[PDB]
Amino acid sequence: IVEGSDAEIGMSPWQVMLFRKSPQELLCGASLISDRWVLTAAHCLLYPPWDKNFTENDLLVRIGKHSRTRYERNIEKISMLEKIYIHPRYNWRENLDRDIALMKLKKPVAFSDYIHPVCLPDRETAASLLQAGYKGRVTGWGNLKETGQPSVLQVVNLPIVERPVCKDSTRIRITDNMFCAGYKPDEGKRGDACEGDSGGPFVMKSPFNNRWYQMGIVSWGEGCDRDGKYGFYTHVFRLKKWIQKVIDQFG
């Protein structure tokens, strides 16, 4: 996260760290959606152009964290992966269209003050909240700058951007499964996700029922916090039918 601030304790209890066993390192963010399921970006697990193809055994998920590097004894829970599911139409060859993956945990994680799942939107929640101007919130332990790393979980609130503006900001083909967010240049405020934040959640607080819904997954950008550029997020509601299928079938 670039130009964000330190997260408060328990501010994002669905935030998950995707952790590589060896060499020990942060791979990506992710989010807790129930006691057995974690949502992330497909490209955090599978990206052939860079020889990335992780198996269950290569990875751990760390839940309930604040500090990036510290082992948070009595706070975080570390879970093993039972099975990875990648959207069958995830487009890694071109533009990361449908950048989404689910991970089933070997055992249910116990909820606590620091560990609690986020809601997934339904048709109605998406319709009312996913509007240009409406702000969402992105958290992660990714880079503080495009060109280092934070001591603790970072947070930034960013407005959803009009679709024509998203399209005109880039040469990449944008699809209905993506939305972009971020401030325009000279607005007086900045902020963006960055490398290492991917797979993390873009959440919004419903003013109807006071619940947090994950509307997006940090997906891609051309640099971090550049003027006239915006972060792109997997549109979670558009892919909810696949989410439900995987869960109903294998959960």
Partner: peptide, 28 residues
């Protein structure tokens, strides 16, 4: 069923430092 309600915030009726910024943006 209890999704999206944070034990240290919603559950205790405390607000974090910037959630109000989100609410203020939901003008429509």
């Amino acid at each position: 069923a209890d999704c999206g309600l944070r034990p240290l915030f919603e559950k205790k009726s405390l607000e974090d430092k910037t959630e109000r910024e989100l609410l203020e943006s939901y003008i429509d």
